[PDB]
Amino acid sequence: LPTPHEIRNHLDDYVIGQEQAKKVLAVAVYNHYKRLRNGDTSNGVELGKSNILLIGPTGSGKTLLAETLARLLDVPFTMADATTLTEAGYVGEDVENIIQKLLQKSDYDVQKAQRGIVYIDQIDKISRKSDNPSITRDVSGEGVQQALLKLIEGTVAAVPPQGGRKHPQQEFLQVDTSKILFICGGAFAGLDKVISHRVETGSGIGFGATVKAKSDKASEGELLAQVEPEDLIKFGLIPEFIGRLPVVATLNELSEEALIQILKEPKNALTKQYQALFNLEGVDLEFRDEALDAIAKKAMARKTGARGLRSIVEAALLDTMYDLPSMEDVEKVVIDESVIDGQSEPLLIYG
Amino acid sequence: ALPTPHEIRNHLDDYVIGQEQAKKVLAVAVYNHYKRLRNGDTSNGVELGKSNILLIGPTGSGKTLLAETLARLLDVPFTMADATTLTEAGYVGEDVENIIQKLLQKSDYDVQKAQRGIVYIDQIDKISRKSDNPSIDVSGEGVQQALLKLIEGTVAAVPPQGGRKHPQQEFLQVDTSKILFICGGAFAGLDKVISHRVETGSGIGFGATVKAKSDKASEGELLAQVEPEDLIKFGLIPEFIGRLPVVATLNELSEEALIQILKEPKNALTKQYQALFNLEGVDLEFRDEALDAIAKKAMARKTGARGLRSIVEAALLDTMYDLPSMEDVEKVVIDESVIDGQSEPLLIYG
Amino acid sequence: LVPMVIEQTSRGERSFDIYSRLLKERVIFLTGQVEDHMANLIVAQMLFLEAENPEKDIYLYINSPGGVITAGMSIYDTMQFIKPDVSTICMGQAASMGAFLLTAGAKGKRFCLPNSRVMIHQPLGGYQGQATDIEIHAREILKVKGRMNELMALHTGQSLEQIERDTERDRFLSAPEAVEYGLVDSILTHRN
Numbered sequence: 001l002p003t004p005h006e007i008r009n010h011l012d013d014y015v016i017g018q019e020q021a022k023k024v025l026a027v028a029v030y031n032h033y034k035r036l037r038n039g040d041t042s043n044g045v046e047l048g049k050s051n052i053l054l055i056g057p058t059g060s061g062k063t064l065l066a067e068t069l070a071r072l073l074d075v076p077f078t079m080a081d082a083t084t085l086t087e088a089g090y091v092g093e094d095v096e097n098i099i100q101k102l103l104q105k106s107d108y109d110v111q112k113a114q115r116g117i118v119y120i121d122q123i124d125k126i127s128r129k130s131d132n133p134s135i136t137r138d139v140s141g142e143g144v145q146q147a148l149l150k151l152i153e154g155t156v157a158a159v160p161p162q163g164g165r166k167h168p169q170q171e172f173l174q175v176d177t178s179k180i181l182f183i184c185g186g187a188f189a190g191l192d193k194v195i196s197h198r199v200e201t202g203s204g205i206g207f208g209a210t211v212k213a214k215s216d217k218a219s220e221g222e223l224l225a226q227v228e229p230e231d232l233i234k235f236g237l238i239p240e241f242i243g244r245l246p247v248v249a250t251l252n253e254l255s256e257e258a259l260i261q262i263l264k265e266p267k268n269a270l271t272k273q274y275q276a277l278f279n280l281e282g283v284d285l286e287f288r289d290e291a292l293d294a295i296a297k298k299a300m301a302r303k304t305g306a307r308g309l310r311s312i313v314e315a316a317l318l319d320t321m322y323d324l325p326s327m328e329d330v331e332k333v334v335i336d337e338s339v340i341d342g343q344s345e346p347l348l349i350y351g
Numbered sequence: 352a353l354p355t356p357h358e359i360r361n362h363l364d365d366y367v368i369g370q371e372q373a374k375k376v377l378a379v380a381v382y383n384h385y386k387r388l389r390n391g392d393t394s395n396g397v398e399l400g401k402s403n404i405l406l407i408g409p410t411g412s413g414k415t416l417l418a419e420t421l422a423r424l425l426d427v428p429f430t431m432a433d434a435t436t437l438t439e440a441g442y443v444g445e446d447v448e449n450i451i452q453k454l455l456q457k458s459d460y461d462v463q464k465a466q467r468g469i470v471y472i473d474q475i476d477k478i479s480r481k482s483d484n485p486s487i488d489v490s491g492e493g494v495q496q497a498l499l500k501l502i503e504g505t506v507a508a509v510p511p512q513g514g515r516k517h518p519q520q521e522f523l524q525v526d527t528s529k530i531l532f533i534c535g536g537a538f539a540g541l542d543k544v545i546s547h548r549v550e551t552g553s554g555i556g557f558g559a560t561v562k563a564k565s566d567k568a569s570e571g572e573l574l575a576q577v578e579p580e581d582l583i584k585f586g587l588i589p590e591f592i593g594r595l596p597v598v599a600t601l602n603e604l605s606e607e608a609l610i611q612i613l614k615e616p617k618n619a620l621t622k623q624y625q626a627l628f629n630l631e632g633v634d635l636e637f638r639d640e641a642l643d644a645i646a647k648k649a650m651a652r653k654t655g656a657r658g659l660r661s662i663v664e665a666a667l668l669d670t671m672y673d674l675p676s677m678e679d680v681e682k683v684v685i686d687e688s689v690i691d692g693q694s695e696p697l698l699i700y701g
Numbered sequence: 702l703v704p705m706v707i708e709q710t711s712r713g714e715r716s717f718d719i720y721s722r723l724l725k726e727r728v729i730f731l732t733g734q735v736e737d738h739m740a741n742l743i744v745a746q747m748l749f750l751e752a753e754n755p756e757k758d759i760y761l762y763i764n765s766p767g768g769v770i771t772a773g774m775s776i777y778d779t780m781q782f783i784k785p786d787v788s789t790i791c792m793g794q795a796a797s798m799g800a801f802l803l804t805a806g807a808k809g810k811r812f813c814l815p816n817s818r819v820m821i822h823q824p825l826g827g828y829q830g831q832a833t834d835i836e837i838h839a840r841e842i843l844k845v846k847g848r849m850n851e852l853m854a855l856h857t858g859q860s861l862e863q864i865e866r867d868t869e870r871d872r873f874l875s876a877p878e879a880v881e882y883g884l885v886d887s888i889l890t891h892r893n
């Protein structure tokens with residue numbers, strides 16, 4: 001029932017500069033409702049489910065989308081992680097835990113749980129270190145991908161209902177996964193190096209060879225746009241797992257102008273956080289536009305995304321926050337551009 | 352009477368394409384299995400052997416699809432297990448006997464009716480032996496030994512229904528000598544082992560032959576030259592391979608075969624998306640010129656038929672996002688240019 | 702003297718000579734007079750690159766005043782036999798035999814530096830002995846001259862009659878004229 005424009009409008013409030021990614025998720029959400037809502041007793045049967053693979057630089061907002069999506073999503077949603085998963089029932093964790101975690105949110109409703117949505121952060125961690133199969137059996141690498149194959153395609157898995165009162169029950173519930181959607185996405189490391197070898201032959205020294213014109217060329221963001229499944233094979237992923245995930249989204253890296261919008265338009269911006277922190281203290285805060293332009297230059301230099309934005313702010317306001325509680329009759333604080341550089345002190349307004 | 356190989360093969364042709372060699376093998380096994388058990392077996396020939404099939408095939412070649420369609424046509428019980436959760440020495444993960452207990456659920460706990468059932472296992476390559484043995488290989492060589500007993504024919508203890516409490520403390524015996532098993536999975540890297548044998552090396556001199564082309568020894572044409580001795584180098588034990596004499600090789604994909612997969616099969620993606628838009632009151636059409644281009648893009652991904660949805664969804668993405676918002680839209684036409692991304696899919700209003 | 706450089710790899714650091722480093726990138730140097738030892742060494746380099754990769758272009762830099770004919774003809778058949786496109790570049794000078802290996806490169810992948818110079822003339826020889834032996838060696842060197850002119854026309858595209866008149870005596874051709882003469886395709890003035 002919800003429309004792609006309506007669902008995207010809600011995400012736009014919390015996410016900026018990821019227009020392509022938003023489209024992919026909106027279609028999946030609409031398709032998921034469409035797939036289930038219809039009886040499916042039509043000429044076409046066993047409708048396919050297109051899973052989603054999210055790729056983007058660090059701190060681009062992948063994990064943020066999963067949290068905001070669950071708020072607007074009515075069907076059950078879960079936020080699991082691929083770091084703790086271990087194959088063959090080892091001591092670490094089992095794959096069924098993802099389903100067991102879903103029932104906690106769904107209140108142990110099997111028919112309602114099969115229609116749920118799943119998110120798995122840090123998917124790159126299970127990638128094979130080398131292109132060739134590991135000599136030993138990796139318990140948190142290739143092995144985990146193998147166990148997910150039958151899960152994403154559709155199967156039945158044992159689920160202890162409620163955990164059980166004691167050994168007395170010793171039974172498990174069977175739940176289907178053929179209809180369950182999966183959103184597996186994580187920031188891959190070193191993927192740009194693999195794509196460069198395959199996109200630009202280069203790597204020559206002679207006259208005929210085309211050496212890179214500049215030191216800074218073939219930016220990380222551009223390479224992801226030209227990603228293909230064959231490139232991930234050299235990265236370590238098995239073709240079997242990738243075949244289960246046809247769609248491959250791309251999140252362009254943050255731009256200086258986007259960060260300025262991130263501090264004002266979003267409701268959870270850092271400016272609004274500290275503004276509320278001092279609001280209870282009876283003190284106001286101000287951030288002029290001239291200060292935001294300087295902060296953008298500093299953030300991209302850290303090559304950490306939006307998550308590295310707090311370091312620029314808090315390093316400045318460190319001294320300020322230390323002296324404000326002791327100080328009295330302080331009603332407003334102003335932070336000009338100079339303060340960010342460290343050549344000035346924030347102006348204070350007294351009552 | 353039981354169906355004939357031509358009738359059973361005709362059914363698979365409706366859902367599977369380009370697997371003529373494999374279809375005959377499966378039909379014969381099915382025909383033999385029905386023929387074997389239907390007869391009392393107290394004839395001139397006694398203790399008839401059971402041929403076990405090993406399905407080797409590239410990714411997305413249609414192995415899992417055959418087992419699903421096969422179960423529909425056959426009346427006898429069928430199960431779809433996986434070699435990922437199997438654990439040796441009865442660990443907490445899963446046991447080999449669980450397959451039998453799961454088989455009874457489909458058969459309603461009928462032992463005489465269960466022995467005539469069929470078994471299907473996937474991801475067999477994951478249980479291969481590893482040269483290095485640092486552990487304290489629960490999912491490797493150990494699982495192979497546990498299956499051998501099942502394939503050779505023996506009875507395994509199975510608690511019927513799980514039991515109400517400790518009181519019962521009993522298990523049912525279900526022979527397995529008559530049960531057929533189809534263990535097949537897409538092996539990874541097998542071409543390299545076979546390549547060393549048939550290539551005969553790459554001499555650098557004039558007379559010696561080198562890999563002139565970038566690719567050579569095509570996976571489809573290479574797997575046909577597979578032998579049991581090659582699988583030993585991969586990690587499988589010869590005893591386990593001895594229990595599976597039959598072997599079926601599958602060609603990955605044929606450019607012309609892909610065109611048929613989008614039109615002839617009932618579960619084709621085109622028919623799936625066509626029905627997806629039928630409820631929305633919009634029709635869909637696919638020109639033949641567009642399907643030829645999709646094949647070239649699909650083969651480039653080296654993912655088989657499963658990698659085809661990426662090409663379709665990548666095009667219709669923009670459409671599906673603006674289609675519900677749009678009104679008075681009665682038909683959509685997809686051209687070849689739309690796939691490349693140069694053009695935009697055409698729409699027809701009414 | 703030959704300087705040593707260090708090439709950084711994932712496994713570790715490895716020390717290579719300047720000539721060996723360029724060979725790893727499919728680059729061969731043709732320096733000095735063309736003799737049996739220098740020629741027999743280059744053939745092994747070409748074959749080695751063919752086996753490693755037969756689909757990547759090879760680059761051959763020529764700076765030599767020419768030399769023996771028979772040593773150079775072994776290279777011509779080798780460049781034509783193998784599948785990879787042998788790119789040729791002229792640095793400094795290209796004499797009679799140096800020019801033949803230059804034009805023998807792959808069509809469309811031949812370049813000459815802005816200040817390079819090419820010179821072409823007829824084969825040189827001589828013999829001392831009976832008149833019967835002089836006639837034998839004279840007929841032999843004449844076939845080579847005829848054979849070398851036919852191949853020069855084949856790659857340059859000019860007519861055999863034109864090659865006969867231009868090769869009667871020494872003829873110097875500047876870098877721009879080489880393009881107009883069909884010997885090369887373009888000039889690598891600056892990096893783009």
Ligand SMILES: Nc1ncnc2c1ncn2[C@@H]1O[C@H](COP(=O)(O)OP(=O)(O)OP(O)(O)=S)[C@@H](O)[C@H]1O
Binds near residue numbers: 014058061062186
């Ligand atoms: N588009 C955005 N708009 C506003 N804040 C953003 C945006 N993207 C990221 N952030 C900030 O970055 C924080 C973390 O974002 P994440 O979703 O974790 O990014 P990420 O791609 O998931 O990085 P990883 O892989 O989880 S370490 C959020 O809490 C926001 O403060």
Ligand SMILES: Nc1ncnc2c1ncn2[C@@H]1O[C@H](COP(=O)(O)OP(=O)(O)OP(O)(O)=S)[C@@H](O)[C@H]1O
Binds near residue numbers: 410414
């Ligand atoms: N011959 C075919 N005709 C039509 N669709 C096919 C064909 N082969 C494969 N497919 C499609 O591929 C899907 C999965 O095929 P599979 O049987 O799983 O191939 P596979 O060899 O089992 O790959 P693995 O090993 O399971 S990852 C099916 O649901 C079909 O949509």
